[PDB]
Design a protein around this ligand. Sequence first.
Ligand SMILES: Cc1ccccc1C(=O)O
Length: 518
Amino acid sequence: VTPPPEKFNFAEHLLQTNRVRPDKTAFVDDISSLSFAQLEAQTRQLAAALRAIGVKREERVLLLMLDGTDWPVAFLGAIYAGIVPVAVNTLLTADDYAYMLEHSRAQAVLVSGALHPVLKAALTKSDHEVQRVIVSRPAAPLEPGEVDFAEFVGAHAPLEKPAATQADDPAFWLYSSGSTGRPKGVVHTHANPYWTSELYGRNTLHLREDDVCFSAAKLFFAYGLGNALTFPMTVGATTLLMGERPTPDAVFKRWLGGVGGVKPTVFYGAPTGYAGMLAAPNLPSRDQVALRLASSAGEALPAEIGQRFQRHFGLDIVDGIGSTEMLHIFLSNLPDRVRYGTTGWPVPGYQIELRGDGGGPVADGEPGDLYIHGPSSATMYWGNRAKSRDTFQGGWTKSGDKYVRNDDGSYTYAGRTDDMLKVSGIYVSPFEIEATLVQHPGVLEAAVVGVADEHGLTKPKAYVVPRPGQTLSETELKTFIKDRLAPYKYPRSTVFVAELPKTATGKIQRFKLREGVL
Ligand SMILES: Cc1ccccc1C(=O)O
């Protein structure tokens, strides 16, 4: 793969790629579609609009939007202007967004109507610098000074040229949380999504122009941003976008061509989703779908789910691993070489090392900490030099995973270095779940660990010491956590215990809870 030039604006790159196919559909959702020409026009009109309201090159804007055709307009339009969109998870709290507004010093916000109430609370509470709120598909009346996204875009002529950025200039941020502390601003450059899209999208997956891409993973996830924006636009594929929560039924409707007159050929999702669909009584038959490639990430794929999928559809599930910091997948099975029980082989262009307790070598078959050297690495966590030092170790990026290398050169997952769980395809901190449980007045103590379910997928499990003299039922606790945690964070079970295993300092011995001592 040829490196991108030094003068490179990633948005311009994707637009120029598709000037050969102006009338092909670029994006379609439940209510709208954009051809590549339409996407270009709206992108460049947005870029002008953000400049007209005073947002300058290198300044941030918050992009808080459901998957839909306005999403790539927002993302690429900022980047075309040389403005840095901060693309964020749509299921967070107003407090999370308040922190992000302050930390990013976002100058404007692009927000879905459905997300305007949480955003409004974030604005009200924070010491932000937001000059304008631009609302895509408003669900309530606009407040004074707010603007409808379609009017904002429509009222401005297209920007005539892109910002003259460098390949290594920041292009956009994603946020990533660790087991404690605030979300970290992962800073990606213009070059980074070129590299993922070429090394993985084109050269590993072999995506092509006649593909229709559909990702259960939303656009704000690094995984989904590649799958459903950077990858398809690199090759000229059409992409289907869905605003709603993925369920088996929602995914099947789309697989069957229920939206936009298109049937996906490439699907992407998490192993939990694949398990859910395979359990669904109305799982479509092979002859009803146009799938040629199924990608998986977000948690280790249990071999049985891949094997069952292949028995049913005649398609393997291609499981790979990436990180937010590396932008996309660097270690993967291949469409024509799958070894279930493994994450496959290093992606050409990326070097992988396993390091032991001193940074030393680990013998094949022994677990080490995974480090990656490749050209799509983020540069830093913005404003966090200490965590930057820990993760970005001189050309090598630490992922937080442990792995074993097998005799065939494949790699098998061996857990985390940082207490995080990967549940339903998403990172969740046990300490967050514990923090929520102990605020119930009936709970004295709580410890949360990962447990494999009947399909071998990790789900949280809570061990709770009740407070003497209160009452506390499992169902009381279910109701308490309902609206305090996202549903993927719900413990799959709660065990009430009289005490937890601890050191003499009171540190919970979590390892004993995984080993079944209770
Ligand atoms: C965390 C992540 C980011 C980009 C692509 C894949 C992954 C993963 O979940 O393995």
